Amino acid sequence: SGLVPRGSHMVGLIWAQATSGVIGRGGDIPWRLPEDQAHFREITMGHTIVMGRRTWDSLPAKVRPLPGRRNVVLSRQADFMASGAEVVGSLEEALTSPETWVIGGGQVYALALPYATRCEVTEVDIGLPREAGDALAPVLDETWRGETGEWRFSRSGLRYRLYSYHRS
């Protein structure tokens, strides 16, 4: 289950959420957590990362494409271009690698969920209620089985915990 044969197409989702399920607001993530940034890099490095066009927009121009990973951006706009990366019009076109991490945002998590067999979640204990127009984490049905870590404490003074979910 843990090994990925090279002829397969494994799809995982990775996200960080507040306890309310908020993942994004106003084109940004409404907190910063260094431990989550390190965790995201550790999981995704060396693999293909797939993101929605609005998540590409949310990365500073100087930092994208993200290093050490093949960057794929989803857009329906025939004139949207992502310098340094590949833009495709569907998840089917994006999922050609043996191991793909979908890195957001809310629309693309919902789109990719039917094909995903792993989710890696960071939950931040920050009280941020859901507001209209927020991007939200996908909801996971009972086909998913999860492990929840104990609450840990960030150098930034926020509690956080990690979840790992899997399905067949």
Annotated binding residues for NADP(+), as ranges? Answer: 15-16, 23-28, 52-55, 74-77, 89, 103-108
User: CB under 5 to 8 A by kind: which of ligand NAP, ligand HEI, none does 31 bind?
Assistant: none
| Residue whose pair of structure tokens reads 């960057």 in the numeric block | 71
Which residue in this structure is represented by tokens 């857009």?
75
Among 11, 22, 50, 66, binds ligand HEI (CB under 6 A): 66
Tokens of 111: 């789109």
> Considering the complex, what minimum distance in angstroms separates the CB of residue 55 from ligand HEI?
6
Based on the shown chain and the rule CB under 6 A, indicate whether residue 16 belongs to the binding site for ligand HEI: yes
Q: Which segments are annotated as binding site?
A: 14-16, 23-28, 36, 41, 52-55, 69, 74-77, 89, 103-109, 122
Q: In terms of DSSP bridges, do strands 10-18 and 99-102 run parallel, antiparallel, or are they unpaired? A: parallel
CA nearest 90: which of 53, 54, 63? 53
Q: Does 15 bind ligand HEI (CB under 6 A)?
A: yes
Nearer to ligand HEI, 14 or 72 (CB): 14
Which residues are near ligand HEI by CB under 6 A?
14-16, 29, 36-37, 40-41, 55, 66, 103-104, 122
Residues that bind ligand NAP (CB under 6 A): 15-16, 23-25, 27-29, 52-55, 58, 74-77, 80, 89-90, 103-108, 111, 135
